[PDB]
Structures are given as structure tokens and as C-alpha cells.
């Protein structure tokens, strides 16, 4: 019994972490090999930042014009080159540091952990989630931006996300590691919409599956549905409609519990159309959704 | 526009993770200069731990019994030595990452961070509180035991907590570095009360605080309390009594926000006494008391490690 949201050690990730610095404006790196990675709008004044010609302003930079700094050790930059929304500055030095990595576009569902950087000095680690509609409920402050988000299997960090944004609505987009943002957003300061937040459905399932392992069960009534059925009520519910893939996903937690999947689909539903009644499932007031079922199965 | 439980960088304590087994059990040990510490319990069967005699099992116990892993690497224990209710296993090597640190003894109500390691390798970070009946609320599987709990000062680490229990009723109980454990508990398969719980007052209102300054402010009201008045309504809700001392440690979000303690008080009485009435604060449902005033202060001000 117990069961938290838990970001992956970020060891691997702080030796990567370097500041960069180009005029005025100071932000995070990540330093692997003999290539630092960074947001293009390090070269933005906060005037630039309205309607930034990144290409232009790209071009009045030298090697020189930018400072990186691995804790105390100043890097030497080589070389720059824009792919992009990433900023890609060779330095004459590779990592000594650098872990077994690759670089991983994200499915919307799927969870990392950040690690929040401030003038590229670790500050602190957290789980998120990509949201459906390509957001992230994370703590960026200014100075953030180039924190990296990523999943570690052994030795091996996937780095997943880079922040570069904060909306006007609050809300923080970024990129992957080739610099193509998540969602339909720009690195400009502008409005931007996120569309509808809806909630992961499998996710939402899977924490169920979590809570029952765990032993808190009052929610499980006597109703079955279909996929069909329970999809018209998540629809209405700005939840993500089940698929087979989903049920697929889920089947070791259906074998452990003995729940069928679409029992499952039954329970949340009731929970959908009659509240959580002021009561609480693994400490949650609500549902939790940015567990994925690999998360579930990992703690469980 | 945004604020999480954030836990520690965990660089410098995974740096520090072992694994140490004595016969049939395995679980954590931290590696501090040329010392492996872990739970006494390492040393008992299953049935030893229904009525264990620390001293007896562990004059039975020779150096050759502790098998100690770093990553690949076995480490050779050249002597073995019990303080209170942890194991201090000598090794021949002094380990080469040890960072700055210090043992302290933390607080009800303080938070850290915890290191959940399994067979000496680090699977996970996250933030706990120790609760005002010195329990954790955190998620310890088979095998989590010697994941120690620490905070960060700058560069030096600050380790506060190891595991050693679960405890029937699914609640976590552990010990400082030096092996003393909080609260009640022992290191004995045997039932055992935890006190009742409270909610840790001080930190609902450090994380109020943190609302406003993200931009929620709708608990906000135009009412007032005075301490006592207040105290009469934690009461009731099994809420910590608030002093002088946990309004001084508030005075500098009081400043921020210009929103002053009592006031805060006023908006959280009303939180209590009428619920919230299906909105949501900083995205959740119940009130959160596993944020301290300083790590409101810490998130909000960005501080690096």
C-alpha cells in the first residue's frame, strides 16, 4: 500500500546541463558529445521576442557572441547552426559526462520527468504528462527555458522535451530535441491557443487499476459497457475515446486484479455521471491521469 | 503559472546507493567515505523479525555475511557494528563520490526528498513530508528499504531519513542517519499504533500563498480572525494549532502577495468550515500540506543546487 507520481533520477541529466549566454540573455543547455543544444531564442531581445526573423538575427551572431559555461569550465564554441527551433553550438569539447542517449518524439499521453533548470544549474525534478493537446502542467520560471524533460530505461536517457514557452493562458509548450515544437505553437510572443485539454483516458484507467492493487476499491459497481457506449460517455466528458490499442495496454493490470477492461470502463463511467461524492481514490480528490500504464505497472 | 511538488536533484546520493545482502535479504545502503549504512533488520529472517534480539543475531553474524554491490563492483566489509537501530558496515574502499553532507534530524511537518532505490539501484525520486505522527506517506515496495530521505543546501547534502518499516496498516516508518527511529516505531514485525494524524497548518497556508502568487486567487475574502479564534477551528478539523513562530515563517509570502497571515487565515477557516465546493486550488481537489513556507519560497524564486 502507497503509490506517488515519481520523476527517474536525474543524475545522468545534471552532468549534460550547461549555461548559455548570448548578449543580454541567459538560459539552459544540454551538452552532449561536442554539441550543446538550446533554444533560438537565447539570440531574442525581449523586444525581438514579438515577431522575431530568427534567420536574421541569427546571422549577426559569431561563434564568439556565444558564452557556455559547464559549471566553472567556459566551453569554446566552434560552430552554429539553426535546426529548427534549436540552436545547435559545437564546442571544441566533448562531454566527459555524456550518458548512453537518444533523442524521442513523444506520443500525447506519455510521461517524463523534468529537470528545471535555472542559468544551468539544476533546481529541481518532476513527472509530467503530454497532454492531448500538447501542453505541459509543469513550474517554469523565467530562466527556465532549455530545461530538458526525459525517460531513462537502465542506462539509457531519452531525452523527450526542451521548454521554450509560457502562453499567455499560462500554459508551457516546447520542442523535441530536433527543435519541432509539440502542438501548433511558435516560438514568438504572440497569442497562441491550446486546443481543448481533454483527460487520458488509459491513463485514468490505469491509476484505477493502481488504486484497486493498492486496495481502495469502494468505486467498483456491478456494470459492464462497451467500448461504443463508454465512448460516448467520454465524449461528453472531454475524455479521450478508448481504442482496442488502449484495452491492449492494459491487459497485464486486467490480469493481475481480475477486471476486465470494459468493468473497468463501467466503474469510471459511474464516477463520470455521479462525481467522486467527496471521496478520495490513492489521496486524489480527482482523476488522475498522468500515470501511463507502464508507470502503474513499474511502481505496481 | 505553475507550481508542483519538485523533489531535490538526486545526482550526489545515487552517487551513494549500494546494495548490501545478508543471506536471503537484500535491500539499500548509503556509502559514505569508507562506511555502508543500512537497517539493522538486513540481519534477520522473516521469522527473526516477529521478535528479533539485535544484539544475539548480530554477535552470530560474521563480515563474510554482508554481500556489498556497487553497481558491478563488490565492495569487501572489513568490520560491522550496530548504532541504535542502524548497521555500519566498514568497507575496505572509501567511496570516491561522497559529496559534502551532514545527519540531521528533521522536524514534523518538514519535507525532503527520498531516493527510492531497489537492489541498490535508484528507481525514482519524489518529495515527501514527515507527518505530525511521524509516518510517511510515500510508496516503499519490497525491497526500498535503506532509501534514505535527504534535502539540499547549496552543495551540501542534508540526510535526514532512512526506511526501514511498513507498517500493517500500509504506513511507512523509518529512522535518522544515526538510526533513531521517528516517532513510536521499531524495527519489529509486530502491530503497531501510529498516532492520530494532523494537518500540518503552517504549510496549507505557505501553499495558499503559492496560489496567489500563480495567479488563483478566488478563496480570497474581506473577513478576518485573530490566532486563538482560528485555533478553535483547526481543532475541530484535526488541523495543527498555528503559533507565532508559523506566522513569522510566513511574513515573507505575507509580504510578496500583501495578503497578511491572519487574513490567510480567514480564507482557509472558510475553506474549512464550508469545503471547497468542487473547485479546484493549483489544480487540486483537497487542501495540500506537503509544501513547506520555504519551499514555496525555494519553487517561486527558482533557487539552484
Known sequence: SGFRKMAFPSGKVEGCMVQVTCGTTTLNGLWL??????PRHVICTSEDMLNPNYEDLL?????????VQAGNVQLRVIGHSMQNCVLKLKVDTANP??????????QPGQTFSVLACYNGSPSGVYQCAMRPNFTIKGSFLNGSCGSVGFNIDYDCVSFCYMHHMELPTGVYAGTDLEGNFYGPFVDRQTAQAAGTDTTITVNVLAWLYAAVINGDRWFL????????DFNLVAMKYNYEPLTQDHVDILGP????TGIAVLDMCASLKELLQNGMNGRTILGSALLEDEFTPFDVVRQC
Open 59 to 67: 546571422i549577426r551572431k559569431s561563434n564568439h557572441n556565444f558564452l
Open 97 to 106: 559526462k555524456t550518458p548512453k542517449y537518444k533523442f524521442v518524439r513523444i
Open 33 to 38: 558529445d561536442d554539441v550543446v543544444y538550446c
Open 253 to 256: 493490470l486486467s490480469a493481475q
Open 221 to 228: 459497481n456491478r456494470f459492464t459497457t462497451t467500448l461504443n
